[PDB]
């Protein structure tokens, strides 16, 4: 049982994916194009986390999750890299609205009972990566 | 190493160290290191204890040194007989009486001040204790 | 730990919830990971059911307030209460399939009607239909 964060319609590479779950007994090509097959619908260049699930006979299933908060916050701030020193160096400025969108996606993935709570968590990430909410 | 910039005389009598101390309460900071013993404090011991406390609190807050080594201590060199005048000044000391507050600290939590003072007390030749500022 | 002002406040709140609700289901929940709980919480919020783990001493206290005295004896061992504040049942239902499915914990006694409900026969509540089923 292994967890990755793989690029949408991309899979197979050796330093990225290969070795990682390859050294657990996983059929590479199968997962590659099954993963890509279902992640076709994702927007281009959204890094998506997948939980791979292998059984004693080397066969496997997997679940796709919503992209990381840090990722969506990177894209929402229009940036590429979080701050090297978050809350000492500020980078990005997502509106309360962008927070809410990201929150609803990640709401499909949160544990918040309300929009506000989820949004607060996403804000927590946004703070953690030196993005200000503006 | 603390030392008077200049003095009226170079050498002093041995004297005695009787009596209790003046300045027995924390007057500048909030925590203090009060001496319960009697003895001398050389300038090196004062500097050693200061560095131990300065590094203990990672150079934070404020630290006062309430004593100053103003008494010169002379020594005769080796293989020298008695007489032929007083020896040369080698180091400076501050006479300490029981109750003298040696160091004061401010701007740090008490639990951190105790460890800082504990590290500094290990460098001093006299027994000390932890005191805190009180309402006079 | 919990100052006396805390625990008084914990009681008060659990008691106030007890007044509004209509069907209380009590169960052991020991030996279940937090993920399966977190899952049961989304199933409680969804189904309008209030969920709390509370000290058995502390439950006895505010529970003696209204018709919740029969449950006293259900407060021996690890206790999880389920307050279906909007609609009745559904918790009683929910807990058992969740109970069966996970073969950890047990379920103790429920209570409706100001009458204690015996572990086995809870199947009564756990089969009571919807409010819009009499149409």
């Amino acid at each position: 049982y292994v967890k990755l964060q793989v690029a949408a319609g991309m899979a197979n590479p050796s330093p990225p994916v290969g070795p990682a779950l390859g050294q657990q007994g996983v059929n590479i090509m199968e997962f590659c194009k099954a993963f890509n097959a279902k992640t076709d619908s994702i927007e281009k260049g959204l890094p998506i986390p997948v939980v791979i699930t292998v059984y004693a006979d080397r066969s496997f299933t997997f679940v796709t999750k919503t992209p990381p908060a840090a990722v969506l916050l990177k894209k929402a701030a229009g940036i590429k890299s979080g701050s090297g020193k978050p809350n000492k160096d500020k980078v990005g400025k997502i509106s309360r609205a962008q927070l809410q969108e990201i929150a609803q996606t990640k709401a499909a993935d949160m544990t918040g009972a309300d929009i506000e709570a989820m949004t607060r968590s996403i804000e927590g990430t946004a703070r953690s990566m030196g993005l200000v909410v503006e | 190493m603390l030392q008077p910039k200049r003095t009226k005389f170079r050498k002093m009598h041995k004297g005695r160290n009787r009596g209790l101390a003046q300045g027995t309460d924390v007057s500048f900071g909030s925590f203090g290191l009060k001496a319960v013993g009697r003895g001398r404090l050389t300038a090196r011991q004062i500097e050693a204890a200061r560095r131990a406390m300065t590094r203990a609190v990672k150079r934070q807050g404020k630290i006062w040194i309430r004593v100053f080594p103003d008494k010169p201590i002379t020594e005769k060199p080796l293989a020298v007989r008695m007489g032929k005048g007083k020896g040369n000044v080698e180091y400076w000391v501050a006479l300490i009486q029981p109750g003298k507050v040696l160091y004061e600290m401010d701007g740090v939590p008490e639990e951190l001040a105790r460890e800082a003072f504990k590290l500094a007390a290990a460098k001093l030749p006299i027994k000390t204790t932890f005191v805190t500022k009180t309402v006079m | 730990a919990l100052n006396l002002q805390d625990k008084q406040a914990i009681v008060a709140e659990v008691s106030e919830v007890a007044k509004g609700a209509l069907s209380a289901v009590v169960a052991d929940s020991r030996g279940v990971t937090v993920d399966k709980m977190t899952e049961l919480r989304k199933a409680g919020r969804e189904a309008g059911v209030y969920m709390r783990v509370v000290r058995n001493t502390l439950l006895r206290r505010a529970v003696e307030g209204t018709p919740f005295e029969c449950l006293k004896d259900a407060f021996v061992g690890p206790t999880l209460i389920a307050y279906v504040t909007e609609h009745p049942g559904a918790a009683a239902r929910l807990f058992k399939e969740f109970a069966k499915a996970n073969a950890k914990f047990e379920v103790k006694a429920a209570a409706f009607e100001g009458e204690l409900i015996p572990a086995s026969q809870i199947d009564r509540l756990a089969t009571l239909p919807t409010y819009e089923e009499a149409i």
Partner: protein
């Protein structure tokens, strides 16, 4: 509100005051107003606990001596040079 029980001192001086502190007591004095000053004894550890609170030096205290309450304020305190002890307290009539 702090209430203190005290006894009038029978004799003063260095020798008498040191015998008090050896007997877990300590002298004090009450002056102020037109009355004559009054020398008293106090139980040390009991007073030592009260003075550990900041309001002890701000509020008005009552000292019952010969069953008579006197409202005073802590004026000055003589502490031991290096021990957590009290040696003398000045009380001024409120």
């Amino acid at each position: 509100m702090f209430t203190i029980n005290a006894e009038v001192r029978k004799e003063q001086g260095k020798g008498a005051s040191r015998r008090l502190r050896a007997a877990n007591k300590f002298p004090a004095i009450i002056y102020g107003g037109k009355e004559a000053p009054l020398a008293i004894e106090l139980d040390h550890d009991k007073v030592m606990n009260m003075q550990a609170k900041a309001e002890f030096y701000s509020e008005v205290l009552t000292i019952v001596v010969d069953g008579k309450e006197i409202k005073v304020k802590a004026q000055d305190v003589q502490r031991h040079p290096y021990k957590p002890k009290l040696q003398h307290i000045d009380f001024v009539r409120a």
